[PDB]
From a paper:
One of the primary functions of M proteins is to enable Strep A to evade human innate and adaptive immune responses. Despite this variation, the primary sequences of M proteins generally have a propensity to form dimeric, α-helical coiled coils, as verified by direct experimental evidence.
[name]-[name] was likewise in α-helical conformation throughout, but strikingly, only the [name] portion formed a coiled coil while the [name] α-helices were unfurled and asymmetrically disposed. This was best appreciated by comparing the structures of the complexed and free form of [name]-[name]. The two α-helices of [name] protein in the free state formed a coiled coil, with amino acids in the core a and d positions engaged in ‘knobs-into-holes’ packing. Intriguingly, analysis of ‘knobs-into-holes’ packing of [name] in the free state shows that A77 and Y81 are not ideally packed. This suggests that the segment containing A77 and Y81 may initiate unfurling to bind LL-37. The loose ‘knobs-into-holes’ packing of Y81 in the free form of [name], along with the conservation of the Tyr in M proteins shown or implicated to bind LL-37, suggests that this may be a general site for initiating unfurling.
Numbering used by the authors:
A (entry chain A): 38 to 99
B (entry chain B): 36 to 105
Amino acid sequence: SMKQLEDKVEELLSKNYHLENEVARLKKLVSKLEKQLEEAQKDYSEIEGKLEQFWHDYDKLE
Amino acid sequence: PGSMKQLEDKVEELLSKNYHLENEVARLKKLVSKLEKQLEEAQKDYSEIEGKLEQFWHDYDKLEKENKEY
């Protein structure tokens, strides 16, 4: 029964290990995502400023 | 007995951390898909402005094109 508990802590140890590998994977993916989203936001803001500027310039020729 | 209680303490510890780790896996998965939604929508918005720019240049160069035909 002591052998049983040692078996149990080993079982839990390896399940714990795999969970924490998955948690690290998912956290690295959250960070990659948040960087990508920041990048997409700056991009959108840039191309919106561009479109607005070309139309502003165009309007200026009246 | 005593060493048995020490191992049972290690088991309770692992059991709780595993429950919390599964909760965090679920939570992080939710977070990941929310971030993917937000990214995909930002990409929609970018693509929309890009289409607007392409149509602007099309309309603009259409002036020169038709002026050459006059």
